[PDB]
Symmetry: C4
Subunit: 86 residues, 4 copies
Amino acid sequence: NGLNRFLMIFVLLVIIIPVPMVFIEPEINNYPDALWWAIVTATTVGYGDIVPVTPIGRILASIMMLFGIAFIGMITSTITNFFRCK
Amino acid sequence: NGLNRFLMIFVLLVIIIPVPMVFIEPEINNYPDALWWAIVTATTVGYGDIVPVTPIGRILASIMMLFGIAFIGMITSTITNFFRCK
Amino acid sequence: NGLNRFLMIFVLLVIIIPVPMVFIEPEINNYPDALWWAIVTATTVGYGDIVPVTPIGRILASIMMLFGIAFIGMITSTITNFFRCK
Amino acid sequence: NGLNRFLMIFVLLVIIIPVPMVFIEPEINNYPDALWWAIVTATTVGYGDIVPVTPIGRILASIMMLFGIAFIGMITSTITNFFRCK
Ligand SMILES: [K+]
Ligand SMILES: [K+]
Ligand SMILES: [K+]
Ligand SMILES: [K+]
């Protein structure tokens, strides 16, 4: 249940956070562009095609990155502890 | 056998996925450009020189990223559990 | 106490290092721009919107990256060893 | 001795690989620019300021990325197995 609780809140961020981003950012004008940026930021790829200019968007992006690196550590723990037990 | 099964399906993506990408994307016009992008997307480097514009290409890129971060966790588990035994 | 000591020195960098960066770099002209770059460099996202041109800034950025990848490994160890105990 | 052998070959790549890169790439014209790119590629940051255009440089960059993600897994294993034993 510990793994499911960590991914459900992560999936919600990658779905809920792209919604306000469209309105506050002058570069983003629709949800598909913000959703694509969300995946890119959450997977720590960062192409640089879409970048938050406003400080409000930069604070929101920092949360996505902090939860993005934590997601990598959560997936790693799901495989590492799976073979360590037996 | 668990590690080999996870990497063979990963290598398959970085080989098969660059093929449709060339045709659907107007930016990519040849396989060497799409293959280079595939490694960059999988290793979670993301330079931003090659970016999927079409939504079809963006969905395909998301799979490459999800399997890309999972690959990092698979390589980490291969070293962490190796010394954990003894 | 081992985890707290590793993150307090990390957070210190993402707070202290953006200060000299503003003065030595001609691209950066204020702290909010350098602070945003610091989080992006530490989380290993790297958009490329802000880049160190001077060699002094490039040496400082390398420390942020080395401590950035070490931070990913520290968060992973905090979850992997948590369930490994029992 | 296992950890030292993995980092000495990695440090060598980030020092030796930037040397041929300067000559084969028309974008790179000196060692400090190629050395900066090497750190960026090895730490999986990828700003996109410096990108390999030639296929020769793209093959060399792929090795740096494969050894770059493996370096993250090596540093993680050095901390995870340090607390797991006791
Ligand atoms: K980038
Ligand atoms: K990256
Ligand atoms: K990364
Ligand atoms: K990047």
